[PDB]
Amino acid sequence: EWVSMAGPRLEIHHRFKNFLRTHVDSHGHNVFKERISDMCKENRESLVVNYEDLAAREHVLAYFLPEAPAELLQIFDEAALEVVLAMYPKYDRITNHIHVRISHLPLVEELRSLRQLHLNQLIRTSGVVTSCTGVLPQLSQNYQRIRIQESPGKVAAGRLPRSKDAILLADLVDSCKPGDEIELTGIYHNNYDGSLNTANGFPVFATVILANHVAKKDNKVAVGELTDEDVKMITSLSKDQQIGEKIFASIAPSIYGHEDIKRGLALALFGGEPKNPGGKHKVRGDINVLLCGDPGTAKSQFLKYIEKVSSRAIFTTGQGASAVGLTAYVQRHPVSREWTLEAGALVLADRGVCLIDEFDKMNDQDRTSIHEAMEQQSISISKAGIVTSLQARCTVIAAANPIGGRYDPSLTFSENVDLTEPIISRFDILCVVRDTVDPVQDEMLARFVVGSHVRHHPSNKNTYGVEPLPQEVLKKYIIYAKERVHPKLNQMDQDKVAKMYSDLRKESMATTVRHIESMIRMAEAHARIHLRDYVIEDDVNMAIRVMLESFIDTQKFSVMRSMRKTFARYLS
Amino acid sequence: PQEEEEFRRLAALPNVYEVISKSIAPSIFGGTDMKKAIACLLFGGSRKRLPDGLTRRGDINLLMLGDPGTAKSQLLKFVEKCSPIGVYTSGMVLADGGVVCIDEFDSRCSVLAAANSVFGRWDETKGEDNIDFMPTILSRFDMIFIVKDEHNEERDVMLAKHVITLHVSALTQTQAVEGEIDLAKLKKFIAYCRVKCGPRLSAEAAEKLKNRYIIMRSGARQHERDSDRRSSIPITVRQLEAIVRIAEALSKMKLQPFATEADVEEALRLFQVSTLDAA
Ligand SMILES: Nc1ncnc2c1ncn2[C@@H]1O[C@H](COP(=O)(O)OP(=O)(O)OP(O)(O)=S)[C@@H](O)[C@H]1O
Ligand SMILES: [Mg+2]
């Protein structure tokens, strides 16, 4: 109301013009002139201004912007347009209206946190895009209506993900895709809808956010949020010669033994480097893990721990997972009735991890759709006249139980598990767990279990010999390693691997390229564990060792002894 | 209008056939005959009507059989990308004058089909009975090709080196090897050639093809009679029509109004190498 006064309004407009034409960065460069030159070169229609600098320079503007967003933003758009006209008179020929974008709002709020008090106020929110509409013209302009759900990782268990509507105009149109995690800065306005009033029986306003700035939530934001103390602790950990041992021992403290399974799962978690050689073929940088186990080996416990640790994680069961559920599907909107895409579990697992429990229960028809996403990490949906492509870069961990409930060592791994050969081929790491009656191991298991039971009472609330790391420290290490390291394989001896692969061919025909690729990305991940920009051959040796162990574990008993004798050089 | 002169210059060279063959999937090692067959399928023949109302097919049909790993799906994808109209299925109305690729074989459309062996891998000693399709549906295909995993110690090394070089050098540079035509340029050239004109055979070529057809029919006779077994790939007048169509496509590639004896000879050689080896 006070802003609507003409005098203060005009004075603030000219003050904002002086801010545009007067601000100086710490390096002595007028940033906005470079930004406007870049926009003119790119013929864009929007201008991005940092809220932090405006708050630092003009406190009154920073106070006014969240309170009177629409009028002040229109005034700033007019000021930017006239500044552009004064600086670039010809720019009226390419564009007729220029919009100001506000970025980095200090106040970030969740979709659950939306109340009445935030109505008609600028709010910053975070979420994941689920469905989007097309480009619609208006007799005023470009229109986009999208549906946003809360990020599954942030959502607590047992409570449904809530959904909201968002509107994008002109430049913001087509700036996002379904299944993409984004944060928004926009106005929380209310809309009048008589259908809701009739249905509920009282006045109801459907609140829809009109976003001003859209930013995809890449891990760059997470990198920025990292404290320098976290970085120094991670670097101090990296120089330790036994960093790998403590990292492996830090996973599943409550479970005793089973070094190979935790080794493989950590190695898959750290992930490799995806590559696109030539833009002609794409080599995946992801590890798919299969865990076949006799009952009583705490496979579900491992899956649950992985679910908790991961920043982004989705848990699914065998029986409740249909082909339509796992993937995105086409549906007619109940209100507007245009074809829309709803993302499945794998789509929301993009850049995250997906866990499959009781994978042996999968129907073959449901299995068929899995191979495409496993091999190409992308899904092509061709339904109801709509053909779309969606990213499916996810790390898949699957659990399985042998047919009959007991693993037979006298049979091949293919025979014991009711899965087709291509599915197993897509998996990079295979781990089989058996049950043996060893009195000393039984003593160790019983003692560790009873000790853990005593420790974790609510009233009361290693094999390598290394102290496990704190959970938060491990998570921070994982994030930093994922977002900083990019190893290079410039010191690999091709003759040794070629001879080993020839021997592998000999002893496999006696009983492929993707195995080589899996070993390569495994070495890359092991290098990423040590935070090394270049790969040392020790990573290659360890990857060879673990891959050979996994391969021999899948063979019959009559041949694994000969395999161990032949390959005693590498296993030692 | 300027592109018409470019297409005329490209088609007036004495080596258009070799350039087109090299332009068909330069990444894939070998298969020069398969590349030429794919090229002439893409160019295609010409349809002719008759006053009695009857129409004769102006499109070519090819079938491929071989062990897995012979790069069959890659050729189908390349054909679908290169063709102005292209459909790819996993096993027709929306395609008019285009090419339809059909994997797992076990309306004016050219058909390119891929299939696998009955037992999974080819058995040379068993000979016949490795194809489950009936002769009735096999007769429609103009040509049939058989690919086998020719295991050579040096050939595997060469293939691995070629694949690794393709993997490595692809980000570095994307350039034609020796005068290869761009995908868009080749697409426009094929469209222009198809739209512009369609050739017809000659009397001498017709007589030569008739004599060769009679000789080949007698040979297929004698092979069947001596073998005391019915061949799964019979030879009928449809094979003669297919050879005529291939010769017409070869003449169309040169935009000549009348086909020459060289086109008929090349068509006969390709038909021999495909069908007679397959049969
Ligand atoms: N090696 C182990 N060390 C410690 N506790 C274990 C171990 N194996 C099993 N347990 C305990 O046994 C409980 C039940 O194990 P489960 O996870 O149900 O067995 P499972 O191996 O997953 O086979 P299924 O999937 O249940 S048929 C776990 O929650 C653990 O508390
Ligand atoms: Mg379990």
3-state secondary structure A333-390: CCCCCCEEEECCHHHHCCCCEEEECCHHHCCHHHHHHHHHHHHHCEEEEEECCEEEEE
**C-alpha distance from B169 to closest chain A C-alpha (Å):** 7
- Residues framing ligand 1 (Cβ under 6 A): A 255-256, 293, 295-301, 401, 445, 449
Contact A247, A220 (CB under 8 A): no
Closest ligand 1 atom, residue A433 Cα: 21
Closest ligand 1 atom, residue A293 Cα: 21
Contact A268, A431 (CB under 8 A): no
- Structure-token pair, residue B33: 């005959």
Q: How far apart are CA A9 and CA A72, in angstroms?
A: 9
Contact A173, A144 (CB under 8 A): yes
Q: How far apart are CA B267 and CA B262, in angstroms?
A: 9
**C-alpha distance from A280 to closest chain B C-alpha (Å):** 8
Contact A354, A394 (CB under 8 A): yes
- Structure-token pair, residue A502: 């020839």
Q: How far apart are CA B47 and CA A448, in angstroms?
A: 82
* Whole-number Cα distances in Å, A42 to A37, A94, A141, B148: 9, 11, 20, 54
- Structure-token pair, residue A507: 């002893």
- Structure-token pair, residue A521: 């990305």
Q: Which residue of A has its CA nearest to B156?
A: A502
Q: Which residue of B has its CA nearest to A279?
A: B171
**C-alpha distance from B195 to closest chain A C-alpha (Å):** 30
CA of A358 to the centre of ligand 2 (A): 8
CA of A159 to the centre of ligand 1 (A): 27
Do residue A277 and residue B174 have CB atoms under 8 angstroms apart? no
Q: How far apart are CA A547 and CA A42, in angstroms?
A: 50
Sequence-distant (≥ 6) Cβ neighbours of residue B256 within 8 angstroms: B199
Q: Which of B27, B92, B29, B35 lies closest to B62 in space, CA to CA?
A: B35
- Structure-token pair, residue B109: 């459309």
Do residue A278 and residue B167 have CB atoms under 8 angstroms apart? yes
Q: Is B49 helix (H, G, I), strand (E, B) or coil?
A: strand
Q: How far apart are CA B106 and CA B115, in angstroms?
A: 6
Q: Are strands B55-56 and B48-49 parallel, antiparallel or unpaired?
A: antiparallel
- Tokens 């870069």, residue located: A393
CA of A465 to the centre of ligand 1 (A): 23
Chain A and chain B share a number of CB contacts under 8 A equal to: 17
Fold observed for domain B2-279: Rossmann fold (3.40.50)
Chain A residues inside the 8 Å CB shell of B168 = 277
Contact A444, A304 (CB under 8 A): no
Chain B residues inside the 8 Å CB shell of A280 = 27, 166, 170
**Kind and range of the H or E run holding B4:** helix B2-11
- Tokens 């969740």, residue located: A110
CA of A265 to the centre of ligand 1 (A): 17
Give just the sign of the alpha carbon dihedral A487, A493, A497, A500: negative
Chain B residues inside the 8 Å CB shell of A276 = 171
Angle, helix A471-484 to helix A299-309, in steps of 10 degrees: 70
Do residue A277 and residue B27 have CB atoms under 8 angstroms apart? no
**Interface residues from chain A to B (CB-CB < 8 Å):** 276-281
* Whole-number Cα distances in Å, B78 to A403, A486, B71, B72: 42, 33, 11, 10
Q: How many residues does chain B have?
A: 279
Q: Which of B176, B198, B254, B186 lies closest to B3 in space, CA to CA?
A: B186
Q: Which of B154, B195, B262, B178 lies closest to B46 in space, CA to CA?
A: B195
Atom 27 of ligand 1, residue of closest alpha carbon: A295
Q: Which of B72, B27, B25 lies closest to B162 in space, CA to CA?
A: B27
- AA identity, residue A321: A
Give me the residue spans of the domains in chain B. Answer: 2-279
Is A301 annotated in a binding site? The answer is yes
Give just the sign of the alpha carbon dihedral A248, A251, A253, A255: negative
- Tokens 């670097």, residue located: A235
Contact A34, A28 (CB under 8 A): no
